Amino acid sequence: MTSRDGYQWTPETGLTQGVPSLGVISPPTNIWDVIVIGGGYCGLTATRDLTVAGFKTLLLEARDRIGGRSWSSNIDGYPYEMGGTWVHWHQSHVWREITRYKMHNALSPSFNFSRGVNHFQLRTNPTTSTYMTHEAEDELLRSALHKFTNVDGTNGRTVLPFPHDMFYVPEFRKYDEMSYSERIDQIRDELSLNERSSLEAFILLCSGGTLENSSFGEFLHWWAMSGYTYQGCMDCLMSYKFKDGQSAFARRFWEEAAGTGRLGYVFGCPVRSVVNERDAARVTARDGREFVAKRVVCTIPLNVLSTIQFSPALSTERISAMQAGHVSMCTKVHAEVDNKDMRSWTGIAYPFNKLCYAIGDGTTPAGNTHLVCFGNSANHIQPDEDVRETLKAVGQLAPGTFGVKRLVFHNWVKDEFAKGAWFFSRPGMVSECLQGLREKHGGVVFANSDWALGWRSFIDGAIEEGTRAARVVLEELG
Amino acid sequence: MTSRDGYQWTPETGLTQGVPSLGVISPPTNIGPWDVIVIGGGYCGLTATRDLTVAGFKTLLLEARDRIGGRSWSSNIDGYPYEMGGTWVHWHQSHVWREITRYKMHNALSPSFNFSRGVNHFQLRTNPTTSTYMTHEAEDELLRSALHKFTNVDGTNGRTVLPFPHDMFYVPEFRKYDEMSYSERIDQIRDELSLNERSSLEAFILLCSGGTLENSSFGEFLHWWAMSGYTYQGCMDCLMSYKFKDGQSAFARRFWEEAAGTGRLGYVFGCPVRSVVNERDAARVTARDGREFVAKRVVCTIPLNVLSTIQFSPALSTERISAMQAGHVSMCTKVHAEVDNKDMRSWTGIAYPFNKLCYAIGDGTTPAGNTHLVCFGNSANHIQPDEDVRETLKAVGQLAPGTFGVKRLVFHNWVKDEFAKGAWFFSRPGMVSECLQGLREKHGGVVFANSDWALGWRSFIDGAIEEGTRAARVVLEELGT
Numbered sequence: 001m002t003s004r005d006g007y008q009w010t011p012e013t014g015l016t017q018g019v020p021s022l023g024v025i026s027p028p029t030n031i032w033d034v035i036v037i038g039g040g041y042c043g044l045t046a047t048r049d050l051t052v053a054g055f056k057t058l059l060l061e062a063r064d065r066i067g068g069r070s071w072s073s074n075i076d077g078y079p080y081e082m083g084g085t086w087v088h089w090h091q092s093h094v095w096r097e098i099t100r101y102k103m104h105n106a107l108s109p110s111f112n113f114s115r116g117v118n119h120f121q122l123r124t125n126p127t128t129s130t131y132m133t134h135e136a137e138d139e140l141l142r143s144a145l146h147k148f149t150n151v152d153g154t155n156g157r158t159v160l161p162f163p164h165d166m167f168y169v170p171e172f173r174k175y176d177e178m179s180y181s182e183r184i185d186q187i188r189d190e191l192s193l194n195e196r197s198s199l200e201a202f203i204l205l206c207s208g209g210t211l212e213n214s215s216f217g218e219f220l221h222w223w224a225m226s227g228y229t230y231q232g233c234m235d236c237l238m239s240y241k242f243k244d245g246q247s248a249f250a251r252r253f254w255e256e257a258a259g260t261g262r263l264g265y266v267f268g269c270p271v272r273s274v275v276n277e278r279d280a281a282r283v284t285a286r287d288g289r290e291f292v293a294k295r296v297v298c299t300i301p302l303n304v305l306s307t308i309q310f311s312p313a314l315s316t317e318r319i320s321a322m323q324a325g326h327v328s329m330c331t332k333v334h335a336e337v338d339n340k341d342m343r344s345w346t347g348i349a350y351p352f353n354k355l356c357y358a359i360g361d362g363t364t365p366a367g368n369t370h371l372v373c374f375g376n377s378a379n380h381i382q383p384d385e386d387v388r389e390t391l392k393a394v395g396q397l398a399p400g401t402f403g404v405k406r407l408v409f410h411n412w413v414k415d416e417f418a419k420g421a422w423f424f425s426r427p428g429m430v431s432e433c434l435q436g437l438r439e440k441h442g443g444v445v446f447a448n449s450d451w452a453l454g455w456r457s458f459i460d461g462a463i464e465e466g467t468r469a470a471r472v473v474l475e476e477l478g
Numbered sequence: 479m480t481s482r483d484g485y486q487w488t489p490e491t492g493l494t495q496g497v498p499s500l501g502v503i504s505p506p507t508n509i510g511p512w513d514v515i516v517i518g519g520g521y522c523g524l525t526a527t528r529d530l531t532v533a534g535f536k537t538l539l540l541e542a543r544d545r546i547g548g549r550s551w552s553s554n555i556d557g558y559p560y561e562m563g564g565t566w567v568h569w570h571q572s573h574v575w576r577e578i579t580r581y582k583m584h585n586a587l588s589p590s591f592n593f594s595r596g597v598n599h600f601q602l603r604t605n606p607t608t609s610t611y612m613t614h615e616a617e618d619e620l621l622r623s624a625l626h627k628f629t630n631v632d633g634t635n636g637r638t639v640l641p642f643p644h645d646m647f648y649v650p651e652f653r654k655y656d657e658m659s660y661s662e663r664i665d666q667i668r669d670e671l672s673l674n675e676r677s678s679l680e681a682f683i684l685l686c687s688g689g690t691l692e693n694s695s696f697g698e699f700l701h702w703w704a705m706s707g708y709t710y711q712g713c714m715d716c717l718m719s720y721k722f723k724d725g726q727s728a729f730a731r732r733f734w735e736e737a738a739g740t741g742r743l744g745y746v747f748g749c750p751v752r753s754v755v756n757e758r759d760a761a762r763v764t765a766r767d768g769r770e771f772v773a774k775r776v777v778c779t780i781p782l783n784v785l786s787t788i789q790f791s792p793a794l795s796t797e798r799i800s801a802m803q804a805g806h807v808s809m810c811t812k813v814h815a816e817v818d819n820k821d822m823r824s825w826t827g828i829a830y831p832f833n834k835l836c837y838a839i840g841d842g843t844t845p846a847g848n849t850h851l852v853c854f855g856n857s858a859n860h861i862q863p864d865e866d867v868r869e870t871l872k873a874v875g876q877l878a879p880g881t882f883g884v885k886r887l888v889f890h891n892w893v894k895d896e897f898a899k900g901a902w903f904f905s906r907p908g909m910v911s912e913c914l915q916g917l918r919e920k921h922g923g924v925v926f927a928n929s930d931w932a933l934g935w936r937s938f939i940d941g942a943i944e945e946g947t948r949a950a951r952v953v954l955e956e957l958g959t
């Protein structure tokens with residue numbers, strides 16, 4: 001089943017739009033106690049919980065598929081992860097689901113240093129490269145991240161001992177209010193070019209933004225969640241993916257909800273408005289269709305919420321967050337390349353390149369190396385706009401070492417139903433707005449990974465929030 | 479209300495049996511037909527029961543004790559929760575943290591360690607006559623050093639041989655470590671360890687196993703180590719850092735209240751089971767006093783070390799029988815002491831191998847303003863805390879001789895407890911590789927679920943919840959609707 005989402009390029013086809021996905025639901029409709037808006041992990045979790053608990057639930061989704069900001073496309077026997085990819089057993093909510101759905105043994109490691117070039121390629125200007133062992137890479141990143149995170153003498157353990165409760169130590173607020181650039185400026189004289197370049201590339205990989213617009217405290221939050229170490233981060237952020245792709249995982253939620261007999265759904269159904277009435281809420285599609293339920297779980301992403309009409313009017317904090325928007329404009333490009341030895345390659349090309357961080361991520365059945373490449377707002381490319389330029393950015397990660405057989409990507413920035421990649425905050429945004437983003441709104445429960453407490457911005461945060469939403473609805477409806 | 483479980487001692491009152499707990503359920507019964515019977519109201523049974531009742535199943539919970547919680551429960555004594563068994567939790571523990579967050583208790587934790595005032599040192603005792611004192615930074619360094627040597631069997635402290643701890647056979651080299659004892663591993667590195675390194679190492683690993691150096695699986699420790707992030711700090715974070723402000727019984731109550739609130743929960747406490755028999759369309763569960771209960775499926779959460787007391791029909795597999803015969807090795811003695819030294823809030827100690835309590839920390843301050851110490855003993859130098867109060871007081875005092883007097887002791891003897899026969903699961907060499915599949919296996923209409931044979935945080939509160947979640951899933955799949 002082909003989605004409208006996604007792009008693929010090959011020499012023989014050029015650039016084409018729309019790729020297959022297990023996430024595509026057919027037929028698109030099968031038609032209420034609850035309406036759930038959005039079929040990403042947050043909506044899937046809420047819907048699964050609610051239907052299992054006995055509630056008649058209508059899921060309305062703008063796209064032709066489930067998964068939202070995370071979905072996979074199987075092409076020539078290999079799953080390409082268009083958005084959210086990596087998971088770990090230190091991520092409570094996603095791991096709980098993985099184990100309950102018995103997919104704990106269905107993971108693959110992204111890193112494999114068993115053969116090939118077995119090096120990290122650091123490029124700090126367009127004309128040269130520095131190569132080092134993965135051990136040296138580890139040491140370099142450890143050194144730079146130590147200096148970056150050591151605001152309190154314990155790399156964040158003192159100012160942020162309980163990352164689920166950011167104000168537990170009052171002084172954390174000042175780090176939430178700090179930009180990446182402001183922190184770098186404090187340690188600048190203590191960083192070599194190699195340290196600073198790898199550091200900036202890594203922290204911008206995480207934020208998808210710029211040094212000026214990314215919150216230092218939010219990175220400290222990721223760091224803390226991961227165990228306050230570089231290896232903790234690598235383990236949680238980039239180590240383990242589904243063998244069969246994320247869309248296989250999303251299906252499990254879908255199949256369970258569907259099996260209850262209490263699931264109604266409409267795909268290709270973008271909501272334009274949500275109005276609170278007496279004892280119920282009314283949801284209206286762009287095309288005028290109306291749906292009514294006792295409660296609504298709205299999972300529309302933060303960067304998309306300004307397109308919706310709510311009455312009653314949303315709070316001041318909700319509006320300010322929505323209008324400012326989060327900063328992650330990550331470009332994620334998959335390249336299937338003809339260099340077999342690059343399975344064990346990693347690269348940082350910064351700041352001159354429109355893709356700044358990349359890894360060997362797998363081998364396709366055709367025996368080609370799969371590279372996953374990441375770009376941010378500091379030097380941004382829209383991968384769809386000019387494939388020649390996209391290929392150039394890919395190539396410049398390791399000039400003269402490979403030819404590209406395939407590109408696969410989804411443009412999250414230009415996606416009207418995402419308007420950005422995963423949540424990453426501006427300085428001060430989380431401390432100022434998190435409470436407002438999580439607050440009650442009559443018959444509407446606002447739930448999205450964007451404003452979770454723990455693994456905020458992760459698949460895990462989506463599930464945390466969907467679980468909360470279902471709990472709220474169940475308690476309110478008795 | 480007062481449980482039959484637990485002990486307390488004060489100079490004024492002497493030793494008394496039975497302590498209060500929010501885990502005590504009154505009235506002890508509210509009673510079919512029954513869709514499911516869940517045997518045991520520990521975290522495994524509570525999770526299964528909550529999931530099942532919420533999913534619409536008429537569920538009967540049968541519990542031997544007068545309380546919920548099983549191997550984890552708290553007693554509030556003069557406003558302080560004493561953790562009788564399972565205590566510590568962390569957000570790197572998937573199943574317990576999921577429950578904590580969903581019940582909105584993520585902000586209801588307290589840190590055990592507080593080094594902001596007081597003696598602020600680690601006291602290492604390797605013989606009865608002297609002590610070595612060091613900073614907690616030096617303590618960290620000592621343990622990091624010793625645990626590095628202990629765990630580095632593969633050059634990466636376990637990451638190569640056990641990359642996926644939920645799948646122990648992923649790498650073939652792991653089985654030989656599961657089959658290795660603590661003593662066999664130490665023998666491979668003995669010449670590389672100072673007395674201080676080996677003493678603190680052996681204390682720490684025996685803290686974890688509750689067993690002996692000879693009967694404790696090295697691979698099982700490597701499993702804990704891996705689950706925790708393959709570092710000493712990961713271990714400390716996951717094993718001993720954060721507890722519930724209001725005690726574990728407050729957490730257990732949340733599961734109870736949700737299950738009860740469905741209107742689909744039947745229950746009987748003080749109802750020990752003697753047999754479970756698979757019949758044609760149902761299973762029959764019979765109590766010690768002869769009462770019979772019938773349901774379509776049974777979730778049996780009776781612990782491994784207690785299973786041999788139960789009569790099953792049909793007979794169990796060789797693997798399940800052999801595990802329940804051999805038994806797990808954790809005979810941990812856990813003793814709380816409310817003490818008169820205020821400065822010991824920031825104290826930690828290891829006294830090894832000469833003391834019957836080996837590992838201890840300052841864990842809190844009671845409302846009365848007294849330091850709370852928690853003390854742990856293993857099977858290499860074991861004490862039954864209820865046998866002789868004076869011997870128990872002696873063991874406590876020898877952790878820091880001449881520094882404090884004891885105002886109160888609080889403990890439960892897990893070893894002699896007929897419904898536990900041991901503390902948390904910890905395996906003999908080769909036991910998990912040989913028996914884990916057997917222990918997890920279907921048995922007609924009976925689902926065997928317990929932390930003792932979980933895949934991830936096996937032996938933890940987390941593992942109990944993992945297993946309870948699996949059990950409800952199996953039942954819902956097999957029964958439908």
Ligand SMILES: Cc1cc2nc3c(=O)[nH]c(=O)nc-3n(C[C@@H](O)[C@H](O)[C@H](O)COP(=O)(O)OP(=O)(O)OC[C@@H]3O[C@@H](n4cnc5c(N)ncnc54)[C@H](O)[C@H]3O)c2cc1C
Binds near residue numbers: 068082270461
């Ligand atoms: C490129 C990229 C890489 C990532 N990498 C990782 C990773 O490695 N690991 C990880 O854990 N996470 C990763 N993330 C994070 C990510 O996957 C998300 O945070 C998570 O999936 C969000 O789930 P959600 O349900 O909360 O939101 P979404 O998934 O965005 O779901 C909500 C969505 O609501 C719908 N919607 C929007 N507007 C309307 C409307 N008007 N009407 C109806 N429906 C509407 C969307 O179409 C529907 O699917 C990544 C994300 C991206 C984009």
Ligand SMILES: Cc1cc2nc3c(=O)[nH]c(=O)nc-3n(C[C@@H](O)[C@H](O)[C@H](O)COP(=O)(O)OP(=O)(O)OC[C@@H]3O[C@@H](n4cnc5c(N)ncnc54)[C@H](O)[C@H]3O)c2cc1C
Binds near residue numbers: 522523562752784
């Ligand atoms: C001293 C100690 C310290 C611990 N420390 C920690 C810790 O810090 N953190 C952590 O996560 N875990 C810790 N643990 C682990 C521990 O809490 C358990 O692994 C977990 O609680 C077990 O849950 P369970 O449900 O699987 O088993 P249990 O809790 O044992 O529950 C099963 C039980 O079934 C019942 N039963 C037994 N026989 C019968 C019968 N014949 N008929 C009816 N019912 C019967 C028991 O009474 C009932 O409660 C500790 C355990 C102990 C003892």
Ligand code: PRO
Binds near residue numbers: 205
């Ligand atoms: O997949 C992505 O794009 C983000 C960035 C690195 C980890 N996850």
Ligand code: PRO
Binds near residue numbers: 566685717718810
């Ligand atoms: O409470 C206990 O006894 C176990 C041993 C140390 C960590 N938790």
